[PDB]
Amino acid sequence: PTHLSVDTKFKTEGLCVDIPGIPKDMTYRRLISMMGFKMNYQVNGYPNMFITREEAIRHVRAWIGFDVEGCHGTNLPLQLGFSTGVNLVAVPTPLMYKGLPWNVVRIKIVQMLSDTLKNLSDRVVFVLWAHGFELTSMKYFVKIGPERTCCLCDRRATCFSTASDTYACWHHSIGFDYVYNPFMIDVQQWGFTGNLQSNHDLYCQVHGNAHVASCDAIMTRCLAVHECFVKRVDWTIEYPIIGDELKINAACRKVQHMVVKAALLADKFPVLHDIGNPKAIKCVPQADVEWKFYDAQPCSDKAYKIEELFYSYHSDKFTDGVCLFWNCNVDRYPANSIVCRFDTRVLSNLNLPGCDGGSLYVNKHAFHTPAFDKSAFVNLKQLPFFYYSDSPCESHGKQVVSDIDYVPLKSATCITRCNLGGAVCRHHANEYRLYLDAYNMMISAGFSLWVYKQFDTYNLWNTFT
Ligand SMILES: CCn1cc(NC(=O)C2CCCC2)cn1
Ligand SMILES: [Zn+2]
Ligand SMILES: [Zn+2]
Ligand SMILES: [Zn+2]
């Protein structure tokens, strides 16, 4: 049980308005044949065009919502809509394109998918709310066959060119005209009552129905993300490394230790309330403080209400000491907090569009995160950049930068004994620059840092006496 059997039943009720008379009894094997595709009894890595919900969740980075609306069907123009916001009009002869024949429409489809997916996935998963026209339009831009590799690299082939008779991945498909061996899933097969808009609108108010195919494509992908990542969560599923995952995660650990150690040194809190990951470890193990942990899994639907996390009778006095919320999304942070909150609006290859303003952050695991809301931080301020270190001023080993290329560091934010004494040493200059790179990496990945209003790095200078 790995792939979806072609002999699995496909429910056809959603298809009968576009395809009247369609048999109630239908398999994927018969549906694919009706779509104009021939599988030829082939055991070459592509057993079915359709995939299971479990296979779709493993390939969420490949998801592209797709919808087709009749403009007027061999005689009528079709409006092809994608969750990228693109609408194309194919004549049989929010970006809205005018009617053009299939031979040019298919070139645009290949360019659009390749640019969207080349840094995300090795494939495309068309996410549908199948009513008929989208399935019967596939033969005009899709070719299938055995699994193949790119003509310029080792990656699996996703495109085909009729001009050259060659195959390419998303990175090398310029000038290609056919989508090759795409995958697809029909959300209607999951058991829903009522139409797409009524189901989507139960969980999301950010995607309206501007009555175009791309709006339906967007809503379909949104509903699928809600079902697979919001109401249902699976953190066991691992996702491949596609970018700066490791550097970002290492930076996150460095920044957390730096900020918490400095808050404890500057304000000397007798107790720290660490709220979040039930598997968390003390980020500052040498700190004198009474460290208390509170279990809260990452919220994927709405941000936690602070009244439910803190109230209903723990140290009980969360007002004593400091509260640490490291990626623990709450509606309104208490004034005595240290906070790391992912900004869902960030544009990156790790952050995928999500449900109801939320985003799907995929870094080793998939985490649907509720919409970023500035009002959650009303009791705090933005945490400014600083580097603090009490370690001895001593270089050690071969230096990365040569003596002639090295410039001594000058910075008001290098909080060290050497900078207090008027001249930053080589070791602290190296560590400052490495820390600044890690910090910038974390910020640019979408993380935002917030702190209690009394936080002042001026209080760190007296820890050198
Ligand atoms: C032009 C100024 N300047 C930057 C550095 N950079 C470095 O030493 C980094 C930090 C340790 C690894 C390499 C030296 N000098
Ligand atoms: Zn390639
Ligand atoms: Zn939505
Ligand atoms: Zn130093």
Which of 97, 103, 98, 99 is CA-nearest to residue 141? 103
Domain encompassing residue 457: 245-463
Of 171, 195, 230, which one is at a domain's C-terminal end?
Answer: 230
Of 230, 259, 274, which one is at a domain's C-terminal end?
Answer: 230
Residues making up the annotated binding site are 67, 69, 134, 150, 153, 169, 172, 200, 204, 207, 211, 216, 222, 274-280, 393, 418, 425, 428
Q: Residues whose CB is under 5 A from ligand 2 (ion)?
A: 150, 152-153, 155, 169, 171-172
Ligand nearest to the CA of 402: 1
Residue 7 lies in a domain: no
To the query of whether residue 186 is one of the catalytic residues in this protein, the response is no
Task: Let me know whether 171 and 249 are in one domain.
Answer: no
Residue 2 lies in a domain: no
Task: Let me know whether 68 and 174 are in one domain.
Answer: yes
Cβ 112 vs Cβ 84: under 8 Å: yes
State the catalytic residue, choosing from 18, 67, 177, 244: 67
Residue 24 has, within 13 A of its CA and on its CB side, a CA count of: 0
Rounded-to-integer distance, Cα 116 and Cα 349, Å:
10
Ligand 1: lining residues by beta carbon, under 6 Å: 400-401, 406-407, 430, 433-434
Residue 3 lies in a domain: no
Residue 181 region, left (φ>0) first, then alpha (ψ -120 to 50), else beta? Answer: left
Residue 21 region, left (φ>0) first, then alpha (ψ -120 to 50), else beta? Answer: left
Rounded-to-integer distance, Cα 150 and Cα 167, Å:
5
Ligand 1 mutation target, pool 404, 428, 433, most atoms within 8 A of CB: 433
Calculate how far, in angstroms, residue 230's C-alpha sits from the geometric centre of ligand 4.
Answer: 48
Ligand nearest to the CA of 168: 2
Task: Let me know whether 148 and 72 are in one domain.
Answer: yes
The CA-atom distances, in angstroms, between 433 and each of 261, 424, 446 are 19, 12, 20
To the query of whether residue 427 is one of the catalytic residues in this protein, the response is no
State the catalytic residue, choosing from 18, 59, 131, 134: 134
Task: Let me know whether 268 and 350 are in one domain.
Answer: yes
Give me 307's structure tokens.
């009244």
Task: Let me know whether 225 and 356 are in one domain.
Answer: no
Residue whose tokens read 């189901």: 199
Residue 115 neighbours by CB under 8 Å, 6+ apart = none
Residues making up the annotated binding site for Zn(2+) are 150, 153, 169, 172, 200, 204, 207, 222, 393, 418, 425, 428
Residue 122 lies in a domain: yes
Residue 80 lies in a domain: yes
Nearest CA owner, ligand 1 atom 9: 430
Residue 102 lies in a domain: yes
Task: Let me know whether 249 and 370 are in one domain.
Answer: yes
Cβ 7 vs Cβ 28: under 8 Å: yes
Task: Let me know whether 185 and 263 are in one domain.
Answer: no
Sign of CA dihedral 430, 432, 438, 443: negative
Resolution of the determined structure in angstroms stands at: 1.8
Give me 439's structure tokens.
């910090």
Residue 240 lies in a domain: no
Torsion of CA 350, 354, 359, 363, to 10 degrees: -30
Task: Let me know whether 41 and 80 are in one domain.
Answer: yes
Calculate how far, in angstroms, residue 401's C-alpha sits from the geometric centre of ligand 1.
Answer: 6
Ligand nearest to the CA of 225: 3
Task: Let me know whether 278 and 346 are in one domain.
Answer: yes
Rounded-to-integer distance, Cα 232 and Cα 170, Å:
30
Residue 300 has, within 13 A of its CA and on its CB side, a CA count of: 20
Task: Let me know whether 291 and 326 are in one domain.
Answer: yes
Domain count, the chain: 2
Task: Let me know whether 381 and 453 are in one domain.
Answer: yes
Interior angle at CA 288, CA 285 and CA 289, nearest 5:
90
Of 203, 230, 257, which one is at a domain's C-terminal end?
Answer: 230
CA distance between the termini of the chain: 67
Residue 180 neighbours by CB under 8 Å, 6+ apart = 142, 143, 144, 145, 148, 157, 158, 159, 160, 167
Residue 429 lies in a domain: yes
State the catalytic residue, choosing from 186, 216, 244, 356: 216
Nearest CA owner, ligand 1 atom 10: 430
Rounded-to-integer distance, Cα 34 and Cα 87, Å:
25
Rounded-to-integer distance, Cα 49 and Cα 182, Å:
7
> Technique behind this structure?
X-ray
Which of 118, 131, 328, 352 is CA-nearest to residue 224? 352
Task: Let me know whether 433 and 292 are in one domain.
Answer: yes
Residue whose tokens read 């400091």: 322
